[PDB]
Structure 1
């Protein structure tokens, strides 16, 4: 739906970045296919097959741009945020550990 629903992790972050690059390459390659078909289509203007091929290619390109990538970007941003949240709770615990060690040391003196 809104996210690919992959649990936040450094592994997921790496996968999403590779997945995003793939989606962006597909968008550009299909856009070039559409542009090539559009030029030939306009030059002729076996005609209706070009009109269907352009609409089918543009529909796929539009979905990548409006559905699939936005979803990858939302997933990646979600992962990044959740990873920083996990980093924070580790910092908190370590800070208290350092303070408890200092307190223990003072008591021993």
Structure 2
């Protein structure tokens, strides 16, 4: 009984916890970079063009 419970917990972790958290980290990185950095750089460039 104990080995079945432990194996179920480990398999559930490997199949769900990491497999969901890693996409969460990837989506967070993608959103953070491709939105914040891109738009901040674009705003700075537009301001530079305005001054120019």
Instruction: Give the TM-score range, shorter chain.
Output: 0.7 to 0.9
Q: Gaps (5+ residues) in structure 1?
A: 1-47, 99-109
Structure of greater relative contact order (alpha carbons < 8 Å, 6+ residues apart) = 1
TM-score by length of 1: 0.42
TM-score normalised by L of structure 2: 0.77
Whether 1:75 and 2:28 are equivalent positions in the alignment is: yes
Task: Point out the structure with the larger helix share.
Answer: 2
Q: What RMSD in Å do the two structures reach over aligned CA positions?
A: 1.3
Would you identify which runs of 4 or more consecutive aligned residues in structure 1 move more than 6 Å?
A: none
Q: Which residue in the other structure is 1:57 paired with?
A: 10
User: Whose radius of gyration is greater, 1 or 2?
Assistant: 1
Aligned-pair CA distance for 1:65 = 3.0
